[PDB]
Symmetry: D2
Subunit: 121 residues, 4 copies
Amino acid sequence: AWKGEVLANNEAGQVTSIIYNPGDVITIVAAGWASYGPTQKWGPQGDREHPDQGLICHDAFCGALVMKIGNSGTIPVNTGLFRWVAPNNVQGAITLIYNDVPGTYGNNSGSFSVNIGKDQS
Amino acid sequence: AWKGEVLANNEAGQVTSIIYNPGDVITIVAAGWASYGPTQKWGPQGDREHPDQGLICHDAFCGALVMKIGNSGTIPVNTGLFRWVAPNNVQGAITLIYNDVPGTYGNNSGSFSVNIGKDQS
Amino acid sequence: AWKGEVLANNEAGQVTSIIYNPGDVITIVAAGWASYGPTQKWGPQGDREHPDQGLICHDAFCGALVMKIGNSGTIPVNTGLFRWVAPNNVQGAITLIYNDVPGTYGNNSGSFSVNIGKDQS
Amino acid sequence: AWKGEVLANNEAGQVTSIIYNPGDVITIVAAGWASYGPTQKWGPQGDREHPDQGLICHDAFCGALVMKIGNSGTIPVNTGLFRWVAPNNVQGAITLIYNDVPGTYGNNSGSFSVNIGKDQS
Ligand SMILES: *C(=O)c1ccc(O[C@@H]2O[C@H](CO)[C@H](O)[C@H](O)[C@H]2O)cc1
Ligand SMILES: *C(=O)c1ccc(O[C@@H]2O[C@H](CO)[C@H](O)[C@H](O)[C@H]2O)cc1
Ligand SMILES: *C(=O)c1ccc(O[C@@H]2O[C@H](CO)[C@H](O)[C@H](O)[C@H]2O)cc1
Ligand SMILES: *C(=O)c1ccc(O[C@@H]2O[C@H](CO)[C@H](O)[C@H](O)[C@H]2O)cc1
Ligand SMILES: [Ca+2]
Ligand SMILES: [Ca+2]
Ligand SMILES: [Ca+2]
Ligand SMILES: [Ca+2]
């Protein structure tokens, strides 16, 4: 299992110790407060009122937590995943990333605290 | 394991099928959007800018998800709990509740989707 | 989870730290060598060639591992149980016992090493 | 998780659906009765009184259950493994095999019923 923080201003994302293998069942819980610029802060589901101006993940709001598994495209995590199985042929290290527009991470602030574990299967 | 919705306007709370027993390890993931009145909505951590005007749980924001276990006081759930063990002598059915001021639930809207499972121990 | 030894000559049985609660899923693995009298030894499934002359559990061979849950009757364990759920209304502390005829445990020898854990549910 | 039978006379072994990956925790429970030739039968720990005359696994008795993981050497399973982690660099499909001398499986009989699951980690 892995526990750590994902900084909102980390454009490259946070590589975890979790390697997702075919058949794996995982659970993720994410908490905390972060911003993509404004003085306010939002939770792991991001800002439901903000337009998508070229986010790294178009299936989650700006300011949401998302992930990549190996060289997959971005996958929404939001508040977390409960006993979740990845799509076919998706495998590899899990990287957690704050959802923002590439090149605009410099003014981000805060972080999410995240736990990831493999479930019995 | 239990999956279900918790309505923001349900003052009594949602009784789950989960009975927390001594030694149990549990994981909860909560997602979704709800409101304690305003036209906006907030996630399971609630509204970090709103004052506490007599919330059922003073350790979480207005609009956050909280719970009771048996006849315990309110315990913050927020976005969830990862492989969590309850305090000493806390046991019984888990009831999930939206955090608002008693008598003011009538104008609430939305709900959280919540999963609860017992972990290996 | 619980790990310990169950002596063949312990007529009262070995009380474990496991309390089986309704809904619980458990796994048990038992190993080792024991005897109900003879110089030979048998594994946790006992002696398949020996008649039942008044065993505490008539659903397992003499020399097998069995258990009681709370005040239940004896239940066969043998080599173990995989993600097992108890019958309706069966609950309480798990006691492990060597299957022999009451009053004849004094000449028994050896023991089984046993692990018990609760599974995710 | 995988459940199936391992025939005593299957020299090649029974390939399971389980792929053991680095970091995996697994539990195995094996039960039943089998023989390497004689009219008697023995459990998954095999025959503790029989000499090793060139067994595929020298760390378990003749008639015991053993396994290979990928291209590893034989590893004793016996009655099972509880929340077990493989040695460094051992990975791949789990094959279950009855422990006997190569070329002598033709007169074997019976089988073991085996469950294998991955545990939370
Ligand atoms: C209008 O209400 C508004 C527009 C942008 C904004 O913040 C920027 O959002 C960008 C992503 O859409 C990017 O993250 C910039 O760094 C932010 O300043 C707030 C409000
Ligand atoms: C301040 O501008 C403000 C005050 C109240 C409010 O909504 C109410 O909040 C109450 C709890 O504090 C309760 O939930 C009421 O039903 C809401 O109308 C928003 C903003
Ligand atoms: C005959 O083959 C035979 C009969 C009894 C025996 O051992 C006794 O078995 C009893 C249970 O049936 C009890 O455990 C006694 O303590 C044993 O001596 C071995 C062989
Ligand atoms: C001695 O009494 C004795 C010798 C062999 C035997 O069975 C054979 O065991 C071999 C492995 O050691 C192999 O499995 C043969 O197929 C068996 O016939 C029983 C007793
Ligand atoms: Ca930004
Ligand atoms: Ca309200
Ligand atoms: Ca005896
Ligand atoms: Ca043979």
